[PDB]
Chain length 194, copies 2
Amino acid sequence: MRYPESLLKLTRALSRLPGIGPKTAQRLALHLAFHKEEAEALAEALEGIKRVRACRECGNLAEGELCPICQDEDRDRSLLAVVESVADLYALERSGEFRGLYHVLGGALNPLEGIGPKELNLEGLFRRLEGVEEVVLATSMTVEGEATALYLAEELKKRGVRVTRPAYGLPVGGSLEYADEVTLGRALEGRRPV
Amino acid sequence: MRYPESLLKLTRALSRLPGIGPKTAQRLALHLAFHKEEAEALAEALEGIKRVRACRECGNLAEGELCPICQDEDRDRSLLAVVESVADLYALERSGEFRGLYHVLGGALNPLEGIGPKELNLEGLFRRLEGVEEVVLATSMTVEGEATALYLAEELKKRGVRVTRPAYGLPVGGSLEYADEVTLGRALEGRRPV
Ligand SMILES: [Cl-]
Ligand SMILES: [Cl-]
Ligand SMILES: [Zn+2]
Ligand SMILES: [Zn+2]
């Protein structure tokens, strides 16, 4: 469709973003061209995020050295949560049921994609076990996240610390009829007294 | 969810974009933070589009003064296409069945939103009728675009030039069963010999 170079340069850059097809790229590029003020603000914010980097301790996004979680003094440092990504950390933190610390991996273990202990931010985890009561293995509830969990569990039980896994089960407001048979089966097996 | 300032500043700027909710804003903001090279390229392209502006004659997006269409010498200047937006011009131009010139309005007539002749790039149209055989009223096929068409038709027939409207009808690969009754009714009324 497009022909001006800076417009096409913008549309092409917008298309590199994940979950942004060429049709959305064009609509946004046109919009940015017709709203100079907004486009300048976005360029300012993009320059602004050059500073941001992985936290020295977590792997969580941080202004400068330490992330907001690590440099919070009101934090139960007896608790630690292993997590695959920053998006998952935010979800956990948004839940409100956790005031521990986090360790952010680079992803999950995956033999089929050659992803293993060296590729993940893993060796850093074992250096931070000082006065850590509990480690929550809060990896994804997938084949890959479960494989990661079992590996961390084996390695953590060796080094003398208890490990817990968040519950498989039904989601809140969920009907039994529309849940899958595996999730439903785990929910039954992990049923609790009341 | 988020707490670092430049990240939030980016996520907030990304949310100002049309058809971008806060969940997508966050995913993209995180992605840009973890891909410094790509983010710099987007900032470069955003700075790059400061130059872009409305064409002196069309209202179409242009590098500097004139749009690529207006400064193309192989252009049937006997033909002119009135259009509501640049997105529509590109669609028309992508169709391949038009080698005329374009006039880009700022939108369509809409009494309910106080949108009328002064608010649209309209007065500029009548200055460009020199050696113009045909004007294609290629506004949207809506209540607003039709109202715009009729107004331009009245005003153009006064100033001595024929006007045409693109066809209402069925789309290519379309079944009759799933088409709406109005579109189907127009397709029948505008049926052609073969
Ligand atoms: Cl798309
Ligand atoms: Cl969303
Ligand atoms: Zn941290
Ligand atoms: Zn032009």
